[PDB]
Design a protein around this nucleic acid. Structure first.
Lengths: 38, 68, 190, 104
RNA sequence: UCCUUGUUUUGCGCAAGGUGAGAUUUUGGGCAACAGCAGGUCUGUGAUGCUCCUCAAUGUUCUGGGCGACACGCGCACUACAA
RNA sequence: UUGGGACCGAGUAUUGCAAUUAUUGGUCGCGCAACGAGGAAUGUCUCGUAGGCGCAGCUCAUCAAACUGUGCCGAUUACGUCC
């Protein structure tokens, strides 16, 4: 497909649960409310 | 064969180094009051042992470890 | 009543049975359950594996080599048949034949590598009680798989054959030859 | 170079002898001065305890009758010899200076 | 925790058994110090030094087509199907 | 082999902006092509684990022998040492 927070279209696009945050990796680009505890 | 019971009277200790074999002492309960001056032979054993375990002996007059 | 105090496989009785050896009597125990099918936790501690009969232990270690193998319930289906076969062949309770075979196929002395100096050295090393049990079982039921592997026409029957010949001390059995040859090194060298 | 040992690994003091006779080893046949050489006294049994019982049974005039003799020997070893059977071992500084004299 | 009154010289504790759903880092995971590596990443970024591409641009194109996937039957890594 | 599939030809439908076995849950040929537990070497787990089995998510015109997660069937040996 294509991405909306980059225009790269490569370095892999997440479209799981209707979000993109893997053309800007979510570890760097957090505050989506996710956490790791386990 | 000879099948000669003996009770493991105690765990003599640890001998060998493979994690396989232990050296243990056997007491004869096989005797009915027949003369034995041996009288408790040390025997190398293969696999896990526990005190009061009977086991058959195919040999007698064993000193186990020796100098070799 | 009539299944409260009475205990059967489903026709095979545990009154008849006696422990054949006196070396083994705390690693050979009697069955009361009507199938050898397992459902408990069978190991957690160094001896907790000797609280249970040879039957159960054998039926679990009966075969492996999965590909879609049916494991326990399948094994039990073969147990039934093999008991009937052994019964009419010995003309005696099949259970008590198993009791015998496990003891008389077991190696009772061994010899091991334990030397040093760039060289090995062998000494007579007595086999422990639980080991006699375990080793015997494995060898007998290894024989089975090999016998049917591309060969015979027999499915349970090979088990019955082995258990018979083992109890007789006959060297047809896969277990017997091992006891023999090992002791020819372990009582010919100390 | 550096004086590692004051007595130089000897029981020979400076300014006395400067020469003490060589002595063979009971391992490798190596020679070293007597003072350098590592003395031990063995007191080696002629029977193990396990066998002592069995023989004392068959005895009447011996064992019970008289206490069993032992083979006595002095053993003078080389340095290398000693260390390899680990009857002498390396020690920290504070301990190296200690002696126990000729007593065991 | 209790108990075995065992092991524990007093201590720190250890083993077996017991109560019990569950016997010790309760159980399984997740986080994690200090010192670092000339490790990887400038094709993740609006995170960037400089200096290369800056218009017959190679940058760039909902542009067209092709490649990354090829096959002397060649070696290795990983996977799966069987006897 | 009626155990296994991998090659190979013919037909058709489905997906798509575009298919060039993309399609593939399909027909029906070839199977009498390999391979019979497989030298040396070498991997990793002690319990609901190993092993066996299936499903979903993931990627996204379309395809999962992959990856991630849940569930089912479920042992043998050891519970020791430091070589």
């Amino acid at each position: 497909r294509h991405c909306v927070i980059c225009s790269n279209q490569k370095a892999v696009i997440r479209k799981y649960e209707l979000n993109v945050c893997r053309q800007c990796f979510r570890e760097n680009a957090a505050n989506i409310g996710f956490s790791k505890l386990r | 064969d000879q099948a000669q019971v003996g009770l493991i009277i105690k765990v003599l200790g640890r001998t060998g180094s493979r994690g396989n074999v232990t050296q243990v002492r056997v007491r004869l309960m096989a005797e009915e009051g027949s003369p034995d001056a041996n009288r408790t032979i040390v025997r190398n054993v293969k696999g896990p042992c526990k005190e009061g375990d009977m086991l058959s002996l195919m040999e007698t007059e064993r000193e186990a470890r020796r100098l070799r | 009543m009539s299944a409260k105090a009475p205990k059967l496989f489903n026709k095979w009785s545990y009154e008849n049975l006696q422990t054949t050896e006196i070396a083994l009597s705390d690693h050979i125990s009697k069955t009361a359950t009507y199938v050898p099918h397992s459902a408990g936790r069978w190991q957690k501690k160094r001896f907790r594996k000797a609280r249970i009969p040879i039957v159960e232990r054998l039926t679990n270690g009966l075969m492996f080599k999965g590909r879609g193998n049916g494991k326990k319930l399948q094994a039990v289906r073969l147990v039934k048949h093999t008991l009937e076969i052994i019964h009419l062949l010995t003309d005696q309770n099949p259970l008590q034949v198993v009791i015998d075979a496990v003891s008389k196929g077991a190696p009772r002395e061994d010899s091991t590598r334990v030397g040093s100096g760039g060289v090995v050295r062998r000494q007579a090393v007595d086999v422990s009680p639980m080991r006699r049990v375990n080793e015997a079982i494995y060898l007998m039921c290894k024989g089975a798989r090999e016998a049917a592997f591309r060969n015979l026409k027999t499915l349970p029957e090979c088990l019955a054959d082995e258990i018979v010949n083992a109890s007789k001390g006959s060297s047809n059995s896969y277990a017997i030859k091992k006891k023999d040859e090992v002791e020819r090194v372990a009582k010919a060298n100390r | 170079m550096t004086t590692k040992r004051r007595n130089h690994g000897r029981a020979k003091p400076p300014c006395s002898r400067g020469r003490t006779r060589p002595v063979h080893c009971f391992n490798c046949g190596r020679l070293a001065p007597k003072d350098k050489a590592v003395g031990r006294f063995v007191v080696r049994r002629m029977l193990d305890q396990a066998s002592a019982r069995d023989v004392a049974e068959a005895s009447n005039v011996y064992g019970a009758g008289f206490p069993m003799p032992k083979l006595y020997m002095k053993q003078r070893f080389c340095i290398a010899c000693a260390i390899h059977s680990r009857t002498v071992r390396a020690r920290p500084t504070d301990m190296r200076k200690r002696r126990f004299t000729t007593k065991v």
